[PDB]
């Protein structure tokens, strides 16, 4: 037997309780970064390591800009929730 909740990976765009930013022209910061990292590293890195790269790219390369001071200059960190039991590689 194995837990019924095992082998599940939840890659959230932002931390619990926080907003998730999306640029009407380029797309969401998260999805943007995820695709880039996967396109560049999915042929060598393990999933958790790629998602960690996504975390850095979103945390460093993105900052909101808004005419509304309330939403201006805000950052974002994604959230990797893993219940995986093995290493995941998109290749063999």
């Amino acid at each position: 037997k194995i837990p019924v909740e095992a082998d599940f990976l939840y890659a959230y765009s932002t931390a619990p309780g926080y907003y998730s930013w999306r640029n009407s022209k380029d797309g969401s910061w998260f999805i943007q970064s995820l695709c880039a990292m996967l396109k560049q590293y999915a042929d060598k890195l393990e999933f958790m390591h790629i998602l960690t790269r996504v975390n850095r790219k979103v945390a460093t390369e993105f900052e909101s800009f808004s005419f509304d001071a309330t939403f201006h200059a805000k950052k974002q960190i994604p959230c990797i929730v893993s219940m995986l039991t093995k290493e995941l590689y998109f290749y063999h």
Binding site: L9, A11, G17, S24, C35, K75, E87, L88, Y91
Partner: protein, 141 residues
Amino acid sequence: DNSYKMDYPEMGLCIIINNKNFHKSTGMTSRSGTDVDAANLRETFRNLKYEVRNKNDLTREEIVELMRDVSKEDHSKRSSFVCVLLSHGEEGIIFGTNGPVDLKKITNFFRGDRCRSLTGKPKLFIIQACRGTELDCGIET
């Protein structure tokens, strides 16, 4: 066995739910820019050899039956499963075009005991959506 078996005949499905326009009653602004994400994910996952299926503007009900029907599929020949949710949301909640849906209700269909052909296989859920109203003001380096 430190790595999942990914040498099955198929990499698996990649269900992308792309909600852009929400019912007027919900009071949720259109998710402009979301099509760019859907197209990006589609291309990206096609390269990883996933069988991509894009669904646009689904109601809270359509999201459930979609997930239910997928979990009821025979994934035997598939290495894994992937589902991406692009929409508005709150903590533990993803929005259909007509209302909220609990993330738990969605993921349960794939529970190790409820979807036998995916037991022991990685089930990925990429969730692009809000999880509350807090803003990260950041800190200088």
